[PDB]
Amino acid sequence: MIVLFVDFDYFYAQVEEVLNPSLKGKPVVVCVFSGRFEDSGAVATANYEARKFGVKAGIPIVEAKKILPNAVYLPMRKEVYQQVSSRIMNLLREYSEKIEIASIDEAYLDISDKVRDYREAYNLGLEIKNKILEKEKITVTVGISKNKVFAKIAADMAKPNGIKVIDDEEVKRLIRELDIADVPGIGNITAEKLKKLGINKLVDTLSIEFDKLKGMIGEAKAKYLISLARDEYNEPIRTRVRKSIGRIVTMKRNSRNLEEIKPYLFRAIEESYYKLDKRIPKAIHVVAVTEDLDIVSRGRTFPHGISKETAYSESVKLLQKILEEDERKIRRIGVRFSKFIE
DNA sequence: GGGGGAAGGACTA
DNA sequence: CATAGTCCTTCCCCC
Ligand SMILES: Nc1nc2c(ncn2[C@H]2C[C@H](O)[C@@H](COP(=O)(O)OP(=O)(O)OP(=O)(O)O)O2)c(=O)[nH]1
Ligand SMILES: [Ca+2]
Ligand SMILES: [Ca+2]
Ligand SMILES: [Ca+2]
């Protein structure tokens, strides 16, 4: 089996560099202004000309202007990028019916067939890269290996605008060298709980009893790690389905009065119903972010689908239930519709 | 004992 | 200090 992973270089930043080629070369930062105080919000992402100076996704926007008070700051237009991605994805299918759109910029193509072996899959990696650059003007990195985890890892650093193959013997090299923290699915929380057990690498997983991995990171996370470390890992490329939609908005100021939070919450529901589009959710969830950046949520599953009116009166209830259970003020409020039916 | 759901939060990207 | 999923642990109901 040979898996080819595609990941578009600084997607949001690059797409904006395309709709206005004049932005190329200079530092570009796609932000997310909440308004709390003008330049409130964080950075969605930033082209590499800006990342070299510390500016990047996650950091507050004000802390970004302090570094590059001359970088072009653009508001995130997620819908434009979502359509460039779709175009670009309905283009990969032309290289394999075995495709999986993991993210808005990440896709996996199973090309165990179309191809030969590496030397060829690699050459199929260059056909895709160039076809994408020609047709949509986007540069992307490509990863090729026995499975997805490694295909995705390979992408790691071939990035940006690169390509890299990880042959079987390289696999059994990283399984012992690559840092456990740079393995897909291992966020700081998990990666940390691992250094606390002595497992600083992937091969160290086979040295510890399964009852302690299942007790720490959980079964699924433990099996996953072990299989990968054993070289037995492979999962298939399966098409994925949207399992939940939502929109969480930022209030101008913290609050705890229902009537003041209503408006914001109702926009979340409205804009969320627009995003559902023909999907009929049977479960509803109202999510809140307390004044001290903590997340609290309440939901309810109905024996049937939810209508716009139902959602309205239901969110209100779950919200009252929230403000009652928690004492803190609310900074952000949103909704999440799931359990569709189709 | 255990399957079957549902709820709420933990964790990742 | 700005969207979602899979996992996950706990709880409740009942054969
Ligand atoms: N809204 C939002 N979007 C993010 C955030 N982090 C990443 N994204 C977007 C940035 C890209 O458009 C897309 C892919 O993210 P990646 O982590 O793979 O990096 P990115 O694509 O920005 O550039 P790269 O892969 O380094 O060339 O997801 C974030 O913190 N907030
Ligand atoms: Ca990317
Ligand atoms: Ca990504
Ligand atoms: Ca990582």
Q: Is residue A238 part of a domain?
A: no
Q: Is residue A342 part of a domain?
A: no
Helix axes A78-89, A118-136, angle to 10 degrees: 130
**Based on C-alpha coordinates, what's the Rg of chain A?**
23
Q: Is residue A177 part of a domain?
A: yes
Whether A106 is catalytic: yes
Q: What ligand 1 atom has the least distance to the C-alpha of A76?
A: 1
CA distance A45 to A43: 5
Show which of A166, A183, A213 is a domain's final residue: A166
Which of strand C's nucleotides are less than 7 A from any protein C-beta? Answer: 1-9
CA distance A297 to A286: 6
Q: Please, how many CA atoms are within 13 Å of residue A325, restricted to the half-sphere of its CB?
A: 12
Write the CATH number for A263. 3.30.1490.100
Q: Is residue A158 part of a domain?
A: yes
Same domain flag for A153 and A250: no
Same domain flag for A326 and A292: yes
Write the CATH number for A60. 3.40.1170.60
Cβ–Cβ < 8 Å for A163, A122: yes
CA–C1' nearest nucleotide, residue A44: C2
CA distance A157 to A165: 11
Indicate which residue's Cα is closest to atom 31 of ligand 1.
A44
Helix axes A11-18, A78-89, angle to 10 degrees: 90
A159 C-beta closer than 6 A to ligand 1: yes
Ligand nearest to the CA of A10: 1
Q: Is the peptide bond before A160 cis (omega within 30 degrees of 0)?
A: yes
Q: Spell out where chain A has E strands.
A: 3-8, 28-32, 42-46, 72-75, 99-100, 106-110, 140-145, 163-166, 244-255, 283-290, 295-301, 330-338
Same domain flag for A260 and A149: no
Q: Is residue A239 part of a domain?
A: no
Cβ–Cβ < 8 Å for A136, A105: no
Q: Is residue A106 part of a domain?
A: yes
Q: How many other C-beta atoms are found inside a 10 Å radius of the C-beta of residue A212? A: 11
Show which of A166, A197, A213 is a domain's final residue: A166
A45 C-beta closer than 6 A to ligand 1: yes
Helical H segments across A77-203, by residue range: 78-89, 118-136, 148-155, 168-174, 188-195
Active-site residue (options: A38, A63, A106, A327): A106
Same domain flag for A162 and A172: no
Same domain flag for A6 and A126: yes
Helix axes A308-325, A258-276, angle to 10 degrees: 140
Alpha-carbon torsion (A71, A73, A77, A78), positive or negative: positive
Per the structure, how many domains does chain A have? 4
Indicate which residue's Cα is closest to atom 10 of ligand 1.
A45
Same domain flag for A173 and A154: no
CA distance A151 to A100: 13
Same domain flag for A6 and A95: yes
**What resolution (Å)?**
3.0
Same domain flag for A192 and A223: yes
Q: Is residue A38 part of a domain?
A: yes
Same domain flag for A6 and A122: yes
Show which of A202, A233, A264 is a domain's final residue: A233
Tell me the CA–C1' distance in angstroms for A281 and C2: 25
A17 C-beta closer than 6 A to ligand 1: no
A315 three-state secondary structure: helix
Helical H segments across A203-283, by residue range: 210-216, 219-230, 258-276
Q: Is residue A317 part of a domain?
A: yes
Q: How far is ligand 1, taken at its centre, from the CA of residue A6, in Å?
A: 14
Ramachandran region of residue A38, left (φ > 0), alpha (ψ -120 to 50) or beta? left
Range of the domain at A138: 2-10+78-166
Cβ partners under 8 Å of residue A323, min gap 6: A256, A258, A330
For residue A208, the 8-state DSSP code is: S
A139 C-beta closer than 6 A to ligand 1: no
Q: How far is ligand 1, taken at its centre, from the CA of residue A45, in Å?
A: 6
Same domain flag for A217 and A152: no
Write the CATH number for A158. 3.30.70.270
Same domain flag for A31 and A94: no
CA–C1' nearest nucleotide, residue A78: C3
Best CA proximity match to A13, nearest among A31, A29, A1: A29
In this structure, the strands spanning A140-145 and A163-166 are parallel
A201 three-state secondary structure: strand
Same domain flag for A174 and A268: no
